């Protein structure tokens, strides 16, 4: 059972610790605020299965905001290609502090 005296009494004991994008003590944002705001406003009145099959794009966008998996993958590939061409011996690079 999932009893809802939580909703019946009208006491917000557990709706502030719960999710991001709530009212923080000082009115400050989170790191991935707007991603969850769009994801929640996508999947609000939806029955949690076509919420999977329809709000998937914004969910993957929020996940790649949160962990930043593919962006670190791209940065890693950049550094590995940098390593192999500096070992090959092309352009000891002055992009740092200069051009």
């Amino acid at each position: 059972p999932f009893f809802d005296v939580q909703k019946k009494l009208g006491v917000d004991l557990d709706h502030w610790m719960t999710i991001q994008s709530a009212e923080q003590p000082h009115r400050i944002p989170a790191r991935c605020h707007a991603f969850e705001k769009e994801w929640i406003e996508c999947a609000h009145g939806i029955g949690s299965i076509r919420a999977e099959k329809e709000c998937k794009i914004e969910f993957e966008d929020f996940r790649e905001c949160l962990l930043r998996q593919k962006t670190m993958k791209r940065l890693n590939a950049i550094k590995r290609q940098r390593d192999k061409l500096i070992k090959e011996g092309k352009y000891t690079p002055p992009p740092h502090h200069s051009g």
Binding site: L13, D14, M17
Partner: peptide, 18 residues
């Protein structure tokens, strides 16, 4: 404002049940 210190400076104006 030292974000985590204000974090732990909750429980008293928001943490009723907790």
């Amino acid at each position: 404002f030292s974000e985590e210190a204000m974090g732990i400076a909750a429980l008293y104006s928001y943490g009723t049940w907790l």
